[PDB]
Amino acid sequence: MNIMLTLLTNVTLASLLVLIAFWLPQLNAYSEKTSPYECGFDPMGSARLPFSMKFFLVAITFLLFDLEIALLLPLPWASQTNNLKTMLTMALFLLILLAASLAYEWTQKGLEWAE
Amino acid sequence: TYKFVNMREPSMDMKSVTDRAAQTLLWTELVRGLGMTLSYLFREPATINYPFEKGPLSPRFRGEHALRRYPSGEERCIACKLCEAVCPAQAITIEAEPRADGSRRTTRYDIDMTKCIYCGFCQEACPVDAIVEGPNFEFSTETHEELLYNKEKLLNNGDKWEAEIAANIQADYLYR
Amino acid sequence: MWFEILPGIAVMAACLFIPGMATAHIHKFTNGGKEKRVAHFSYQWNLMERDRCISGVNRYHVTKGLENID
Amino acid sequence: MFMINILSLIIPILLAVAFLTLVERKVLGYMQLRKGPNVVGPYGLLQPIADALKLFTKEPLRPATSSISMFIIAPILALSLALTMWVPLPMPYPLINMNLGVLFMLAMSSLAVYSILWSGWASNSKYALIGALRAVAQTISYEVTLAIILLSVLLMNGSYTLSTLITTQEHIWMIFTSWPLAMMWFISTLAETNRAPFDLTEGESELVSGFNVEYAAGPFAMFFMAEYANIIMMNAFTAILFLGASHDPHTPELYTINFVLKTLALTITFLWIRASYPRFRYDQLMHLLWKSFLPLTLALCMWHISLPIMTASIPPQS
Amino acid sequence: SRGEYVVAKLDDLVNWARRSSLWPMTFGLACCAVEMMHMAAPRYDMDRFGVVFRASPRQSDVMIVAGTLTNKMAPALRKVYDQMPEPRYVVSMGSCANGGGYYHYSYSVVRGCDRIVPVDIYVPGCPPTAEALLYGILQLQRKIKREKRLRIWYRR
Amino acid sequence: ELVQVLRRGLQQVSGHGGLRGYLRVLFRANDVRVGTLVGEDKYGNKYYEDNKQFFGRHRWVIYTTEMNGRDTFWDVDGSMVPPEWHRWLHCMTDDP
Amino acid sequence: HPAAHGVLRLVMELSGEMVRKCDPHIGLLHRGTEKLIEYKTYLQALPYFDRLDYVSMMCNEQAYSLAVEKLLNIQPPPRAQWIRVLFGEITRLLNHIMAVTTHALDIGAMTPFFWMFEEREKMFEFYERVSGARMHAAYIRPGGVHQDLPLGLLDDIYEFSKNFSFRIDELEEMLTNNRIWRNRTVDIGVVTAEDALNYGFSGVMLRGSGIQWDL
Ligand SMILES: COC1=C(OC)C(=O)C(C/C=C(\C)CC/C=C(/C)CC/C=C(\C)CC/C=C(/C)CC/C=C(\C)CC/C=C(\C)CC/C=C(/C)CC/C=C(/C)CC/C=C(\C)CCC=C(C)C)=C(C)C1=O
Ligand SMILES: CCCCCCCCCCCCCCCCCC(=O)OC[C@H](COP(=O)([O-])OCC[N+](C)(C)C)OC(=O)CCCCCCCCCCCCCCCCC
Ligand SMILES: CCCCCCCCCCCCCCCCC[C@@H](O)O[C@H](CO[C@H](O)CCCCCCCCCCCCCCC)COP(=O)(O)OCC[N+](C)(C)C
Ligand SMILES: CCCCCCCC/C=C/CCCCCCCC(=O)OC[C@H](COP(=O)(O)OCCN)OC(=O)CCCCCCC/C=C/CCCCCCCC
Ligand SMILES: CCCCCCCCCCCCCCCCCC(=O)OC[C@H](COP(=O)(O)OCCN)OC(=O)CCCCCCCCCCCCCCCCC
Ligand SMILES: CN(C)C(=N)NC(=N)N
Ligand code: SF4
Ligand code: SF4
Ligand code: SF4
């Protein structure tokens, strides 16, 4: 309830700022003013063409490591259990496997960008 | 002779290796750069309080142009066109004729201040110290035409700045 | 000089004082002069609801005691 | 009274953002042997007001090639999330008291990522696209490192509650306890807030204003406000997380003063770093966290899992 | 009148903000741009007055044409000027930007940037000193101070 | 000592003729330094010198509030100085 | 563009952000200097050289004067030659300050730019004292120099030179051993000595490639 009211207040304030921005000042638009900016010269192609991503493997590894951090997050509560030895073994197991994944990718050159 | 800017190798003793590892893990040179910036923060700025304070200038400074007069009030220029001949940018236009009393005086003396390169050649070639470059430099205008000076404008500049122009010429004339 | 930066930092610090102090004053104002009750768990929430029930004015911060049991 | 509390949280934040703009100007000037703004007002105190009025009275334009819907949404999202990030912060009392106060901030930061991405894509220009993809890579690296660092530091705490952070730091400081994680967290917060040396999404030298190249007038001012609010909020989070202020329940204003002073010190350190260092390359930034911070972060996470167990110092659950 | 007083105060406030917050586009052509750097330097700090370089023309208020404008460069200058949103101002600096300069009678030099864009201020010199350019900037500020757009509109 | 600096600041406050003069010189010159008055011209401009300041700040001018027919309380130009004081202020000579 | 120095149109083909080819389009600051020089005299063409490399101005003037004097079969006086060399080294200081600080600003560092540009301001004061113009002096001319030095210039130059090595040291304290600067600059734009010679490089490019050559 309170969080919803806060979110509504913030979004309303931002929208009001946009509305004031687009209606208060004097407007004068023509084709040259609204054309895309490429440092004074017309763009040769289009900005919607494919843009090669030289770190494509690191993004997938980031997805997997995001899973790893999601698994690791409930650790502060897991340390309140009586099975401390088992919990410690499992936490260290997960972190060692994550380290092994990082080392394997590093040695197999998955962290290097495409040329 | 010559010297090598970067051809030194690091010593591989344990103490030096540990020092380099401490520099790597504890960002020592980065902290040093921070300290340098902090020192400059606590230093005094070098900013002058313009327009209430002005940067230093010299008697040789080349600013706005002026046509001078003799102490009697007679114009110094004798329509000799040496400045017009020597002007690199061809910024000076001169037309002359005999005056009522027969003097060799100009009727048109134009300087295009948007064409002039402020090189000081005109005042070097003048044999009578007529055309000079005054100390004024804050004469920016809002329209292009206002920078196309003519003889009346240049004579007004000379009458306006005669004291300072005379003082500067007195100060610097023994080097010429 | 470097102390001409201070008035801007002073204004920024004065601005940053307002949120926390305002929150503390509003919490004390709306909880009868006491800290706003923290209910991170159902036990604390049930304590607050019981305080509302026994107050008789539908306000949990209205606390009763020995004069109320007898 | 809750709406009054929301306003008392929002408006001073915006005022502090404007005067942080002024303070950054003057601090950078004095570190660069200049004076900075001292003409518009007394010691330049009306400069933020003049800039805001100029920006919001200047004409905004939508590019002919732009996708207008996402072109407008992005500044709204940026400013909304910048303002929303402040609600769980205890100073010393949070506006909204959450049981998991840190995961909310992580999620809202990851959502605030998309403002720059959608503004760069919606602008429909090559410099904006380059800035957006630089943002993608930067977010990848800083997100993984930040997540694990926060996990470890809060594992020293016992829960994800910032009031519990205060209670934990009642006696000593998490900077004393875990300073290496503090260093890496400071670097990761620089990267998260897109500050130098990691100001790559909008890199003036390489790109002409980066992702906000097409933005002007009011919409641009919203991006600037969001950036500076994020700077202040992240420095406040760092102060609460690592520099715990002593709290007196009967006079809470002392905690507010201490917290504000620590946050100001951290923000001025941000400005100092910007004045001091050059700019990274974004591939070198990715290789900095993945190849240097990530191994050390994993090792320190293992160490901070083991340490409370081997020393019988596990924090209370609540 | 009450409305006249209100509009006078409002456009005094509006002109103050635009005067006190000037953002030149990061745009220099020739030797005249070095004096722009020296005006940005600590000696004549332009950041005191609220004058800050912005790279994007969208976030720029003033175009300082500092250098020679050539036939190969004129379209780009016009393009960036057009992409600058309003209100926008132009300060030509140096003889080359004012008229032709040393290269007035040339096949590849535009004899005046005012053939391309509407110029508000002309700064004379080759190059104008940093103080001369600062004087031109302050003169532009005083020119902005006299604008009465709301006062023109009220009587319109 | 900070006490000496604060006392010098108070002297600067009192050296401009009270708080009102201090505020006047602060808001129309952005500086509150006190220096020896070299002289005053016919238009009202006052000229001050302080050789202890570094070169460039050792001479300055407080412009008049009215020159010719224009109210120059706020609108002050660098072109309002007559040529002799112009030479002295731009340091083409050491003699006022 | 901030990094394009104002009049450079660098048409680049990029695969992502990797550069596939650079095609520098120049001539946006072409004025017809050589044709205008053909139309000028030898004294009237000197400011053209003053405006060619407008960061090493007295150096351009000295080169032009050397050419004209070689054609004329005359000889400047020793004092003129010494003033030429002194101001050529002052101009070299100006140019190297500009180059290093603008390079560091394109990389991302601006504080050295401001410091060394205050130093450039002092050297501009020297230029204005000798010539009356802060940068475009037109002071070195075929046959010697236009005017003699004023009676305090040598002492002020001595003071400046006395206090400048500390400024260079402060510049080095921010860049030389900084790991970010080393990452940005080390093993970037490597050119072999043979390639430099064949492509026609000169000066710092050759000496960086290791060629022991100085005019
Ligand atoms: C291309 O060739 C080249 C050039 O070119 C020719 C060059 O030059 C150079 C030379 C390069 C240089 C000289 C370097 C550049 C120069 C510098 C000085 C670099 C330094 C950079 C900086 C200092 C960064 C500054 C940049 C910016 C953009 C700062 C501008 C400020 C803003 C945008 C902030 C504006 C936003 C604000 C103020 C937000 C506030 C607005 C609000 C609405 C908040 C208020 C909200 C409220 C609700 C408040 C209301 C409350 C009320 C009314 C009640 C309050 C209570 C009361 C009592 C009042 C080179 C090398 C070159 O190669
Ligand atoms: C979508 C949002 C809804 C909620 C809005 C909540 C309040 C918003 C507060 C922020 C306002 C931001 C602008 C501040 C003021 C400055 C700009 C301004 O004045 O803009 C007004 C705009 C101004 O028009 P403009 O397009 O010329 O705006 C430019 C203004 N200047 C010149 C100042 C730059 O007014 C209008 O568009 C309407 C003018 C009168 C014509 C009325 C037409 C009929 C429709 C509306 C009237 C009611 C009809 C009822 C019957 C319907 C059925 C038949
Ligand atoms: C930030 C959130 C939005 C804020 C919304 C507005 C809040 C209030 C705005 C604050 C107003 C500040 C006014 C500042 C006055 C300028 C101070 C004084 O110096 O100006 C003089 C007078 O200025 C002008 O005459 C008018 C200034 C503005 C007059 C006030 C108009 C009414 C403002 C109060 C109404 C606010 C509510 C209505 C709008 C929301 C002329 O000075 P100037 O020549 O330049 O200086 C040259 C530099 N020198 C001195 C070194 C040479
Ligand atoms: C909370 C506030 C913290 C304040 C700290 C601020 C510090 C100063 C801020 C200025 C720095 C900001 C800009 C700098 C950004 C870049 C920083 C940086 O480069 O550091 C990374 C640096 C660079 O590596 P490279 O030179 O590229 O070498 C690569 C080799 N292939 O490398 C690092 O990752 C350093 C990591 C620091 C972690 C701390 C080191 C841990 C020390 C180990 C001792 C602790 C053991 C714990 C077990 C105890 C058992 C009893
Ligand atoms: C105590 C109670 C309250 C007291 C104060 C009450 C008023 C407060 C301000 C309310 C908002 C502004 C209201 C409208 C102001 C007048 C606008 C107007 O009529 O503009 C008309 C005119 C357009 O041009 P025109 O002359 O018609 O010619 C056509 C062009 N070829 O000229 C123009 O359009 C000029 C260009 C600028 C117009 C917009 C700016 C006007 C002033 C706004 C000041 C406040 C700004 C706040 C910004 C948001 C917050 C940061
Ligand atoms: C003009 N010169 C030499 C520049 N380096 N210019 C620049 N804008 N960086
Ligand atoms: S200074 Fe040079 S360019 Fe200017 S009018 Fe004199 S001779 Fe011609
Ligand atoms: S050189 Fe002197 S005397 Fe001869 S025409 Fe020119 S101004 Fe007149
Ligand atoms: S006016 Fe002179 S200094 Fe300016 S660009 Fe032209 S030649 Fe260079």
mmCIF file of C-alpha atoms in Angstrom, chain B residues 44-49 51-59 135 137-138 160-161 164 167-168, chain F residues 28-31 33 54-57 59-61 63 76 78-79 83 86-87 89-92:
data_model
loop_
_atom_site.group_PDB
_atom_site.id
_atom_site.type_symbol
_atom_site.label_atom_id
_atom_site.label_comp_id
_atom_site.label_asym_id
_atom_site.label_seq_id
_atom_site.Cartn_x
_atom_site.Cartn_y
_atom_site.Cartn_z
ATOM 1 C CA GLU B 44 45.164 29.162 -4.710
ATOM 2 C CA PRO B 45 43.400 29.523 -8.084
ATOM 3 C CA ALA B 46 45.002 31.485 -10.918
ATOM 4 C CA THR B 47 41.731 33.133 -11.985
ATOM 5 C CA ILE B 48 41.476 36.899 -12.420
ATOM 6 C CA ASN B 49 38.206 38.691 -11.675
ATOM 7 C CA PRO B 51 36.002 42.498 -16.066
ATOM 8 C CA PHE B 52 37.201 44.126 -12.836
ATOM 9 C CA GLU B 53 40.711 42.724 -13.373
ATOM 10 C CA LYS B 54 42.523 42.651 -16.704
ATOM 11 C CA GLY B 55 45.287 40.420 -17.989
ATOM 12 C CA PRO B 56 48.672 42.065 -18.467
ATOM 13 C CA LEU B 57 49.588 43.670 -21.780
ATOM 14 C CA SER B 58 52.622 45.389 -23.289
ATOM 15 C CA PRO B 59 53.281 48.648 -25.161
ATOM 16 C CA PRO B 135 45.553 49.223 -27.058
ATOM 17 C CA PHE B 137 40.624 45.051 -27.935
ATOM 18 C CA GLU B 138 37.096 45.100 -26.448
ATOM 19 C CA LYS B 160 39.615 58.774 -28.264
ATOM 20 C CA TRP B 161 42.827 56.817 -27.598
ATOM 21 C CA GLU B 164 47.437 55.936 -24.363
ATOM 22 C CA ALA B 167 52.355 56.877 -24.176
ATOM 23 C CA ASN B 168 52.850 53.423 -25.712
ATOM 24 C CA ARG F 28 28.146 43.630 -8.123
ATOM 25 C CA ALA F 29 31.841 42.658 -8.179
ATOM 26 C CA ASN F 30 31.889 39.029 -6.900
ATOM 27 C CA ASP F 31 34.830 39.982 -4.672
ATOM 28 C CA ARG F 33 38.940 42.330 -1.142
ATOM 29 C CA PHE F 54 49.724 37.624 -7.380
ATOM 30 C CA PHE F 55 50.240 39.202 -10.787
ATOM 31 C CA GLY F 56 46.881 39.812 -12.460
ATOM 32 C CA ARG F 57 44.987 40.308 -9.186
ATOM 33 C CA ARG F 59 45.131 45.865 -9.576
ATOM 34 C CA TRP F 60 41.373 46.146 -10.010
ATOM 35 C CA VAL F 61 38.580 48.624 -10.702
ATOM 36 C CA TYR F 63 32.978 50.549 -11.871
ATOM 37 C CA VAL F 76 29.508 46.906 -16.350
ATOM 38 C CA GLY F 78 35.504 46.444 -19.753
ATOM 39 C CA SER F 79 35.222 49.351 -22.199
ATOM 40 C CA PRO F 83 42.504 55.094 -21.914
ATOM 41 C CA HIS F 86 43.145 51.397 -19.183
ATOM 42 C CA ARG F 87 46.923 51.521 -19.617
ATOM 43 C CA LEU F 89 45.030 48.561 -15.323
ATOM 44 C CA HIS F 90 46.357 46.452 -18.204
ATOM 45 C CA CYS F 91 49.890 47.066 -16.884
ATOM 46 C CA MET F 92 51.411 48.658 -19.962
#
